[PDB]
Design a protein around this ligand. Structure first.
Ligand SMILES: *[C@@H]1O[C@H](CO)[C@@H](O[C@@H]2O[C@H](CO)[C@@H](O[C@@H]3O[C@H](CO)[C@@H](O)[C@H](O[C@H]4O[C@H](CO)[C@@H](O)[C@H](O)[C@@H]4O)[C@@H]3O)[C@H](O)[C@H]2NC(C)=O)[C@H](O)[C@H]1NC(C)=O
Ligand SMILES: *[C@@H]1O[C@H](CO)[C@@H](O[C@@H]2O[C@H](CO)[C@@H](O)[C@H](O)[C@H]2NC(C)=O)[C@H](O)[C@H]1NC(C)=O
Ligand SMILES: *[C@@H]1O[C@H](CO)[C@@H](O[C@@H]2O[C@H](CO)[C@@H](O)[C@H](O)[C@H]2NC(C)=O)[C@H](O)[C@H]1NC(C)=O
Ligand SMILES: *[C@@H]1O[C@H](CO)[C@@H](O)[C@H](O)[C@H]1NC(C)=O
Ligand SMILES: [Zn+2]
Lengths: 352, 182
């Protein structure tokens, strides 16, 4: 059936967003945590969307399941492992994954999340667990895997330890710091703890991406690049509203992590426009195709490719070249970035 | 210094029940009932902790550091089936899948800073079969060297004879030090 049946690269996908219905169900039962459904099957439907509802009623889908996973060291490690496998089920030969370590902890964590009581799992223990899972999975399913730690926009308090963890687990799958959460929160990009983290990132060699431009002004993107010094951009769509910045970005070779099917469902793209992306295609821009949250959008990486192919006339020749940009823009050490490309060129029938 | 221990949870393990008659003085027979998983039924589950006995308070409950288990085991039913101390601060565990032809050894070090035990996935060690099950009855136990960076373990060789193998803790491959038709 496949849209693009060749080696792919993925840079923008959320761990909390990519969990198996069956193992949520399993951990619910075990822990005695109540759940809207009982079949692994019809549970996907209560958590999953098909109509393009919006960002309010989307963040509500997390409350359904997250309580069952968080605070359970056994689960953290398992969902990590099970994830690597689902990417190997798609074409994916290299992935970077992002999650908030604080959102899975139940101890030493500012507001304890998801309504759970204290508290044994520290956010450090978490990253460790997640790593052990990703490493076991790289080995067992043969996809190269590195991770990305998230700061939350409404919680600039946390972003201090987020970058500190990033530094200590550098030797183990963590390669970059992100910043998801809520964009349309007043002057968030400027919050003190947030900017000082990204400062330490630059000062310490820790690569940087930022969720910015999804549903929000081209100024959110501006602050991401200028004050925050991002190397890549989560989504970036409403940057086609400031041609000076847009064209100075293509100039400086900015990478755009793009989620086609996510856009439709979050409401960030309205169907009566040409997608943000089709512009990027004609404009020869540095960009990648991702998925964000497969569980909640009920998708596999193929849906984002099947969409781009069908809905907007993408061709294999384009697909090849954006997967190349992806690897080029990836946050791997140079030498391994080289061998990734080597692997890509070869399976695309290109040289060295 | 340390006391390691296992915890078994039999909550949903079915009960076997049978009558016990006792001395003739006992008017009504007793029904012994015991948690016992018959084949295909629901097994116990297990967890593993290590505690430090030097730092015991008498003013605070004492802290036990869980060691989760291989994610390659957590995807389904499993058993803890060997534990062997290697050094004063190094411990080795062997886990086994409910389908007993795949098993995994972990090797864990005390982490002075964190206060926890950390087992790197690059010291893990797999053992498997396609003709049958792993081990004579369960996987064999490692015998470490004094410094605890290598160990000897009886594994089954290429032609199916059980001989002594020599591993480095962070190296997939071992060398057999005995061979033969025995
Ligand atoms: C050993 O294994 C068993 C089963 O695998 C496991 O038993 C389960 O433990 C949980 C937690 O105690 C039980 O779930 C609870 O059930 C009770 C009683 O009806 C509820 O009161 C619980 O609290 C819920 O609601 C609270 C407030 O809304 C919350 O604070 C709380 O988080 C819950 O949401 C909860 O539902 C579960 O029923 C048992 N399962 C069985 C089959 O007995 C046990 O924990 C394990 N024990 C050990 C030592 O490992
Ligand atoms: C047996 O156990 C421990 C660990 O081998 C020893 O205590 C350690 O000593 C080291 C080196 O002197 C210290 O830095 C640590 O503080 C101790 N370890 C821990 C984590 O407690 C101890 O010396 C040995 N037993 C005795 C009393 O000889
Ligand atoms: C352990 O045993 C399982 C089951 O005996 C093995 O898997 C079987 O072998 C092949 C390939 O997987 C198939 O023809 C069978 O259908 C499998 N059986 C089933 C239903 O599981 C496996 O090779 C062995 N080792 C493992 C699990 O790594
Ligand atoms: C320690 O153990 C239990 C907590 O599970 C509790 O009932 C008891 O009050 C605690 N007391 C001490 C000695 O700290
Ligand atoms: Zn995202």
């Amino acid at each position: 059936t496949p849209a693009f049946d060749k080696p792919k690269v993925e840079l923008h996908v959320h761990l909390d967003g990519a969990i198996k219905p069956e193992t949520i169900l399993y951990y619910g039962k075990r822990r005695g945590i109540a759940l809207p459904a009982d079949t692994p099957e019809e549970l996907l439907n209560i958590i999953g969307m098909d109509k393009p509802l919006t960002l309010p009623d989307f963040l509500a889908k997390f409350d359904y399941y997250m309580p069952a996973i968080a605070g359970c060291r056994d689960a953290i490690k398992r969902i990590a492992y099970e994830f690597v496998e689902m990417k190997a089920k798609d074409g994916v030969v290299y992935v970077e994954v992002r999650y908030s370590p604080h959102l899975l902890a139940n101890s030493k964590v500012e507001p304890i999340p998801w309504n759970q009581a204290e508290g044994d799992l520290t956010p450090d223990e978490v990253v460790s667990l997640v790593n052990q899972g990703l490493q076991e999975g790289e080995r067992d399913f043969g996809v190269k895997v590195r991770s990305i730690l998230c700061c939350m926009r409404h919680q600039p308090s946390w972003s201090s330890e987020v970058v500190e963890l990033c530094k200590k687990y550098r030797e183990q799958t963590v390669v970059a710091i992100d910043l998801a959460g809520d964009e349309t929160i007043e002057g968030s990009s400027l919050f003190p703890g947030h900017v000082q983290a990204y400062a330490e990132a630059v000062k310490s060699g820790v690569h940087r991406t930022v969720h910015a431009g999804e549903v929000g002004s081209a100024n959110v993107v501006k602050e991401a690049v200028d004050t925050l010094k991002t190397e890549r951009l989560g989504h970036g769509y409403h940057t086609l509203e400031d041609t000076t910045l847009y064209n100075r970005l293509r100039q400086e070779n900015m990478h755009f992590e793009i989620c086609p099917w996510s856009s439709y469902l979050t409401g960030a793209w309205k169907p009566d426009t040409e997608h943000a992306v089709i512009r990027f295609k004609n404009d020869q821009v540095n960009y990648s195709l991702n998925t964000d949250d497969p569980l909640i959008f009920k998708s596999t990486l193929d849906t984002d490719y099947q969409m781009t192919k069908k809905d907007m006339g993408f061709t294999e020749e384009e697909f090849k070249r954006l997967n190349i940009n992806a690897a080029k823009s990836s946050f791997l050490p140079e030498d391994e970035k080289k061998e990734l490309l080597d692997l890509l060129y070869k399976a695309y029938r290109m040289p060295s | 210094t340390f006391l390691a221990y296992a915890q078994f949870n039999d909550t949903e393990v079915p009960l076997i029940e049978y009558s016990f008659y006792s001395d003739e003085s006992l008017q009504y027979p007793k029904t012994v009932r015991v948690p016992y998983p018959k084949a295909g039924a629901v097994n116990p589950t297990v967890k593993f902790f290590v505690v430090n006995t030097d730092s015991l308070s008498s003013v605070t409950n004492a802290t036990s550091i869980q060691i989760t288990a291989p994610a390659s085991m957590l995807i389904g039913d499993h058993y803890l089936c060997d534990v062997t101390w290697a050094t004063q601060e190094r411990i080795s565990l062997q886990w086994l899948r409910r389908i007993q032809n795949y098993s995994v050894m972990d090797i864990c070090d005390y982490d002075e800073s964190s206060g926890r035990w950390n087992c790197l996935v690059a010291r893990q060690h797999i053992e498997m079969s396609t003709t049958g099950w792993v081990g004579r009855f369960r996987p064999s136990e490692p015998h470490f060297t004094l410094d605890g960076n290598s160990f000897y373990k009886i594994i089954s060789n290429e032609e199916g004879y059980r001989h002594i193998c020599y591993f480095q803790i962070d190296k997939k491959d071992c060398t057999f030090i005995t061979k033969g038709t025995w």
